């Protein structure tokens, strides 16, 4: 329920389930063969 004219007035948006943990866990460009990395 949101009867306001400004969109930022809406309730919280808790449906963004997209994740990309590899920008934190694997920030190399050689994707490591799961085999030695070195």
């Amino acid at each position: 329920i949101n009867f306001y004219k400004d969109s930022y007035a809406a309730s919280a948006s808790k449906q963004d389930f997209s994740q990309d943990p590899s920008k934190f866990t694997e920030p190399v460009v050689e994707g490591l063969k799961a085999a030695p990395v070195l």
């Binding site: 809406a10 309730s11 919280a12 799961a34 990395v37």
Partner: protein, 289 residues
Amino acid sequence: IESIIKTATDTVKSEINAELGVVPSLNAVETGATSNTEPEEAIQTRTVINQHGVSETLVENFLSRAALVSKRSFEYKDHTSSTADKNFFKWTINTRSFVQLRRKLELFTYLRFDAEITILTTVAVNGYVGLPDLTLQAMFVPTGALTPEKQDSFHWQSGSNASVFFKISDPPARITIPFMCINSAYSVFYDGFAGFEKNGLYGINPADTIGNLCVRIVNEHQPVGFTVTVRVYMKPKHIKAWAPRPPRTLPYMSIANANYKGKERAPNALSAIIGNRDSVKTMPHNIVN
């Protein structure tokens, strides 16, 4: 690779491995990558259909909590001979004064969010007659703009400023402040100086300050005095967060900086964050039967 993750990952069964050339438990920490060793590759596993949800650790859920940001107690009385908040206060809005919200926001470098502001007001009779249902004015004044200097000042006519009038009797006042930074995100930390000279403040980009909250009691003073406490609660929403950070470990000292001292001894001391055990071979809560 980006993907939609609604539940924690399943486990596949695995069997005996004895293969030359393939060492999935060996890694190279030096590359900066976290280990990619799966449990299937380290031990012999079963099949587990994992149905555990991940939604409570969504950044929106983790930060859309109404947290206390401001708590001002002021006297509501005749103020002809006081030196102190004379039936009103100004508050330069910040997220730095209450350490539970501050540490959570300081898990991130950049935050973009709207701010749902909730204003709780309580009254006590000064040291009984009853509690009055006073009317308050909370007026949003932008940062550095002209704030009222009197309870009765003509600044409170509020010709363009947003003001909210609200009781003590009624449900706390609630408005939403939009994401109002001149940038696309707030800088939670700012490795820089706000001015073009060198006397300016370190760490404080004023682009990330919401404004001034100017709160008065609208009522004329009663013959007896009251102490009125105003609590302000902020809930971030529609949150985007970037570049996570090491959590704050030492106690906060100031709202103006990241200065640190640490506790006198462990835990959370400067030389020792974790409390001590007797040796690296000492198991501190060892089950002994």
